[PDB]
């Protein structure tokens, strides 16, 4: 019965093993932290130079790069799989579109470049409000929901490690920090968690793209500002889960402008990049509110939806936050990968003349209604 001392590395020694043990000490404080707000504070109290991810970004193939930063696999299509007043919903949607362009006056904008963008923003804003009310009788969950316009959704996570290339810290191990600071045009937050689109740990043949180069090759720069994990509302908010996000593509990224710049393939890549970035940030922030963080992988998958439009076209994406353990230490033997499903863009209405909206397609309206009606079990 020899009570040997434990075979572990020293705490205060200047060695990699000793450093790792000190890291475990810090993580212990998070594990024993009483409340979620204290958990977040301890995690993000220290600010280091971090990549700033932009959900709406013009960089080529940003969608593929964003998957690696998030470990999200994009599967084309919808997730694997009552009575509706289409006359009222169809008429109401036309009223918002027509009322805005043909009717209403405001003060004609000063800048000659944001007029169409300003017009596009208002139709999206009004249409959402009406649909939420018009779909409320069919689904009572929306009544308990909270509707926010142009609120901020943030998420800061660590993924990957690098050796500092130059300077006095040459060769010191440095984690790769990424952040997403987003202002989705419209979002719906509900108290109850939405149902899962697929069982947790579901395996798929498709694999995350692996990028040979560093994140700096596609324009992506680093700054040191406050790290924030924000779901659009503080922790005290009773409504902490998410239902759906509405995003508007900026004018520069619209279909016609990309064609002239010769990046025709990026017409749909722009949609994918925003969907992956924003939904992960929103779902990722939600997990932290429930207390899950990188070391403590999420037990119950978090699911949220988003709809992305350029003003006329619409594309809808579904997301699932299988894992937050996206770090070299915590990703050593993690077989769980986040899953995202997306659909191609569809034109809601071809164009408007006189008092009639030409080329209105019901299919786009039906898909929006289906997303709004999804409810917790």
């Amino acid at each position: 019965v020899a009570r040997y001392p434990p075979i572990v590395a020293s705490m205060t020694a200047d060695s990699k093993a000793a450093r790792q043990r000190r890291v475990q000490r810090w993580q212990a404080t998070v594990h024993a932290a009483p409340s979620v707000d204290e958990k977040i504070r301890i995690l993000t109290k220290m600010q280091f130079k971090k990549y700033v991810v932009h959900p709406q970004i013009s960089a080529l193939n940003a969608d593929r790069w964003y998957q690696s930063f998030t470990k999200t696999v994009f599967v084309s299509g919808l997730p694997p799989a009552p009575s509706l007043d289409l006359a009222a919903l169809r008429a109401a949607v036309c009223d918002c579109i027509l009322q805005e362009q043909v009717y209403v006056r405001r003060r004609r904008p000063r800048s000659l470049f944001d007029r169409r963008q300003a017009l596009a923003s208002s139709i999206l804003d009004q249409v959402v409000r009406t649909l939420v009310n018009l779909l409320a009788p069919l689904n009572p969950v929306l009544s308990t929901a909270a509707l926010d316009c142009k609120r901020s959704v943030d998420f800061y996570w660590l993924r990957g490690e690098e050796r500092i290339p130059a300077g006095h810290r040459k060769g010191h191990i440095d984690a790769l920090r990424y952040q997403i600071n987003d202002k989705p045009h419209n979002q719906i937050r509900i108290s109850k968690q939405l149902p899962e689109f697929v069982p947790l740990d579901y395996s798929i043949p498709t694999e995350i793209p692996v990028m040979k180069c560093k994140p700096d090759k596609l324009p992506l720069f680093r700054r040191q500002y406050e790290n924030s994990i924000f779901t659009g509302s503080k922790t005290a908010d009773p409504c902490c889960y998410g239902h759906t996000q509405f995003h508007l593509i900026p004018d520069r990224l619209k279909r016609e402008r990309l064609i002239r710049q010769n990046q025709a393939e990026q017409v749909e890549a722009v949609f994918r990049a925003n969907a992956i970035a924003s939904l992960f940030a929103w779902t990722g922030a939600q997990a932290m509110y429930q207390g899950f963080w990188s070391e403590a992988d999420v037990t119950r998958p978090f699911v949220s939806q988003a709809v992305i439009t350029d003003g006329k076209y619409f594309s809808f994406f579904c997301y699932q936050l299988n894992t937050l353990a996206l770090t070299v230490q915590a990703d050593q033997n993690n077989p769980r990968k986040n899953l995202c499903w997306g659909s191609q863009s569809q034109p809601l209405y071809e164009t408007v003349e006189d008092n009639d909206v030409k080329g209105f397609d019901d299919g786009t309206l039906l898909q929006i209604v289906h997303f709004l009606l999804n409810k917790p079990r």
Partner: protein
């Protein structure tokens, strides 16, 4: 073109055509690692 005069443009002016160009460029092997699509060039400082 470089070391030459560009006509001043005012509303309604014609399009500017440079028939013979002074800008000469050279392609270089990247110093760092670059994406397969990315290509590096060294160009005259007055080129946009």
């Amino acid at each position: 073109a470089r070391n030459v005069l560009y006509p001043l443009y005012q509303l309604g002016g014609p399009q500017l055509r440079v028939f013979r160009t002074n800008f000469f460029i050279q392609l270089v092997r990247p110093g760092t690692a670059q994406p397969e699509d990315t290509v590096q060039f060294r160009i005259p400082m007055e080129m946009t």
